[PDB]
A paper describes a structure:
HA is a class I viral fusion protein that facilitates viral entry by interacting with sialic acid receptors on the host cell and then fusing the viral and cell membranes in acidic endosomal compartments. HA is expressed as a precursor form termed HA0, which is then cleaved by host-cell proteases into HA1 and HA2 domains, resulting in a trimer of heterodimers. In this study, we structurally characterized one such bnAb, H7.5, which targets a unique semioccluded yet highly conserved region on the HA head. We found that H7.5 binds to an epitope only accessible through transient “breathing” of the HA head, and this observation provides insight into the conformational transitions necessary for viral fusion as well as key information about a unique vaccine target.
Unlike cleaved H7 HA trimers that rapidly fell apart into protomers, uncleaved H7 HA (HA0) remained in a trimeric conformation even after overnight incubation with H7.5, although the separation of the HA heads make it distinct from the closed, prefusion conformation observed in a large number of crystal structures. To interrogate the structure of H7.5 bound to H7 HA at a higher resolution, we employed single particle cryoEM of the uncleaved H7 NY HA in complex with H7.5 Fab. 3D classification was then performed, and among the resulting classes, one class was characterized by having well-resolved Fabs bound to the head domain. Since the membrane-proximal part of the map was not well resolved, a protocol for density-subtracted refinement of this region alone was pursued, resulting in a local density map at approximately 3.9 Å resolution. Intriguingly, the H7.5 antibody was found to simultaneously interact with two separated surfaces on two adjacent HA protomers. Moreover, our model illustrated that the epitope recognized by H7.5 is not completely accessible when all three HA1 heads are close together, as observed in the apo cleaved H7 trimer crystal structure. Interestingly, the heavy-chain framework region 3 (H-FR3) of H7.5 was juxtaposed to the RBS of an adjacent HA protomer, and in a closed-trimer model, CDRH3 of H7.5 would clash with residues 189 to 194 in the 190 helix of the adjacent protomer. Indeed, further interface analysis revealed that the HA surface interacting with CDRH2 and CDRL3 of H7.5 (surface 1) generates a total buried surface area of 720 Å2, with substantial favorable energy estimated to be −5 kcal/mol and an extensive hydrogen bond network between H7.5 and the HA in surface 1. In contrast, the surface between the adjacent HA protomer and H-FR3 of H7.5 (surface 2) is significantly smaller (only 240 Å2) and appears to be energetically unfavorable with a ΔG (change in Gibbs free energy) of +1.2 kcal/mol. Binding of all three Fabs ultimately results in a conformation of HA with the heads splayed apart.
Residue numbers in the entry:
A (entry chain A): 227 to 236, 245 to 270, 270A, 270B, 271 to 275, 279 to 291, 291A, 292 to 343
B (entry chain C), D (entry chain D), E (entry chain J): 7 to 174
C (entry chain A): 26 to 118
The structure:
């Protein structure tokens, strides 16, 4: 890819590349090039959550969302349509009651 | 002098406890194995649902910033449409599980009617409300016999013949 | 003289469910499969998160002054916040 | 001399009308309550479907103009895929409702076979085609008895014994 | 001296072959029509599934090149989400077909229990494991009678009365 700066507004445009092992990244500079001093390597599958909630050192859970966390043993949630990590599905049905027994044939005749 | 019918009773002794209307004034519950059979299947329903929903998710939308609105409209539309698809699937699946749970409850009770009928053959008259009218001196021992599956018309029919037989 | 009556564990008025035949059928015993409990704090029982605060996630590759301490890190969780930014001087990726 | 069988009859008097083959030449229909029970559930099937489809929609595509083709291809693909998903859901749901309707019809008729069997006990021989052979003088009054649920082997069995009994 | 029970037998002669435990040492299989009825429905299950999946597809993604990543992320997300939707639909549909196949197998066998019961009326005692205890000299000819639907209590009951009757 080739690039050229366009004068008329102060801005730094960052561009990125994932360089394969044993390959060589070649750069050609004619100016307006902000060079990296260091590169980056990835280590161990993080979960990038975007949220306003405070941290808690006793709380444990997999589901994170902008308003907090979802800790449950249930397949569905009504809390947020945007979740991170392994989670229950978002539905518009605020109350999906699943019977765990027989119907209530009324106690009084 | 209650007209004993389906043992609604406000029963606390098991989900499928059956009332034994002993003339001596008893109300003992059924063999736990019937209830246990229901428990063995129903309690696992939650886990079956979990395995169908517990998936890895990642952020597509940058909530604290802005994405090109034309794409964002496609994503919002897509997510909303998928939400309705999954909501439909969820309602349908839950409804299926609820209907199946009811069907199971009716099926298990049906099996219990069969247990009485196949063992007594003639002296078990079904009232359609869960009740069998028994034509012999069916005291607590017969309840034990039912629960222990020693209930058998080979002897019990004769005991009822003393109370029911008509020869003509 | 004696009866065998199959009970349905009919407790005092309970709750209702939606089925394939009718909606709002009252049932003795049920559980909700949709939880609405929102825990307003972030769980950290694992490799504790990089709480970027004023630092944005991309900032960790660039090094805004608020990101200087987060230039090299490891965790199973990364937290971004509304006040966070990836730049000090205007830019984009 | 028809071989009266399942009362197909080109019947107009209710969905679940039953033919009473009175030797005197009658063809009266069944208690409307059986038909009504079917009506009470089947007529509501449409409304159950409506509640699952009646949703607010807005235009995404500007039909009289043009949207970037790359996005338009995604939208068309998405809509088409969703159309197949909803078409599948629609066919499946309708098929489920159709199968359930058939199952309901068979279940209700099954209950009506039971109504006859439980009340007569011995003189109701099922032909497997909806017909019961009755072993007593079952004139219009017995049809009224069935519809009024006064049909009872306590008296009717004896009436049949006059026509059926064998002692040995 | 085997305790002949449900004819698991490692049977090769048809899916629904029934063991006839002739005291003379026979193990002949059932009327093929029962098996054929299962075949007529089950073999078509694959075709029913095919008609719901066989659709025209075109390339959206240029696999050997690159598409704008933002759109590609939407497409990959959409396809993956749809894959889960279709995988769910596939698992559910297959599970429904499997449950229905099992229900069909139980239903057909249930009909075969009924065939024996309705024809013999009193001398067919069900063991709950597919076995009927027969109270008469039921040699190969009775098996032919069952398969030819000439099995009839009108004559067979009398043959059993010679072996079973009690007068009191
Ligand atoms: C990287 O290049 C070196 C050159 O000496 C080679 O030995 C090594 O195996 C290469 N690694 C891979 C993954 O090819
Ligand atoms: C997408 O939906 C969110 C709410 O879930 C809304 O804030 C956002 O503006 C929507 N995007 C567009 C482009 O309308
Ligand atoms: C019904 O289920 C709930 C589920 O949480 C349980 O707490 C309750 O005790 C059950 N009711 C009984 C067993 O009467
Ligand atoms: C999308 O489908 C419509 C017809 O429904 C067609 O007219 C339109 O050109 C399609 N869009 C693209 C980009 O092909
Ligand atoms: C889309 O998925 C394919 C693999 O199916 C992957 O190679 C491609 O890079 C993905 N597109 C993007 C933008 O990540």
């Amino acid at each position: 890819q080739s690039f050229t700066p366009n004068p008329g507004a102060r801005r730094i445009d960052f561009h990125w590349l994932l360089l394969d092992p044993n390959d060589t990244v070649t750069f050609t500079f004619n100016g307006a090039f902000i060079a990296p001093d260091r590169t980056s390597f990835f280590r161990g599958e993080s979960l990038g959550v975007q949220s306003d909630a405070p941290l808690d050192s006793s709380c444990r859970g997999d589901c994170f969302h902008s308003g907090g966390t979802i800790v449950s043993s249930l397949p569905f949630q009504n809390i947020n349509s945007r979740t991170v990590g392994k989670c229950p599905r978002y539905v518009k049905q605020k109350s999906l009651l699943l019977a765990t027994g027989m119907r209530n044939v009324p106690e009084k005749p | 002098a209650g007209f004993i019918e389906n043992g609604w009773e406000g029963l606390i002794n098991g989900w499928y406890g059956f009332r034994h209307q002993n003339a001596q004034g008893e109300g003992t519950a059924a063999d736990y194995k019937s209830t246990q059979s229901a428990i063995d299947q129903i309690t696992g329903k939650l886990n079956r649902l979990i395995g169908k929903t517990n998936q890895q998710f990642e952020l597509i939308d940058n909530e604290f910033n802005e994405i090109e609105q034309q794409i964002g409209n496609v994503i919002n539309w897509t997510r909303d449409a998928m939400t309705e698809i999954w909501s439909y699937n969820a309602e349908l699946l839950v409804a299926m599980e609820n209907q199946h749970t009811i069907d199971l409850a009716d099926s298990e009770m049906s099996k219990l009617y069969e247990r009485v009928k196949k063992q007594l053959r003639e002296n078990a008259e079904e009232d359609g409300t869960g009740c069998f009218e028994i034509f012999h001196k069916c005291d607590d021992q017969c309840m034990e016999s039912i629960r222990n599956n020693t209930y058998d018309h080979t002897q019990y029919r004769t005991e009822s013949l003393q109370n029911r037989i008509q020869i003509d | 003289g004696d009866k065998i009556c199959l009970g349905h564990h009919a407790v005092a008025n309970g709750t209702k469910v939606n089925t394939l035949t009718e909606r709002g059928i009252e049932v003795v015993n049920a559980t909700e499969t949709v939880e609405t409990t929102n825990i307003k704090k972030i769980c950290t029982q694992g490799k504790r998160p990089t709480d970027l605060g004023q630092c944005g996630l991309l900032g960790t590759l660039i090094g805004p002054p608020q990101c200087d301490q987060f230039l090299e890190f490891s965790s199973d969780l990364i937290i971004e916040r509304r006040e966070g930014t990836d730049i000090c001087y205007p830019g984009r990726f």
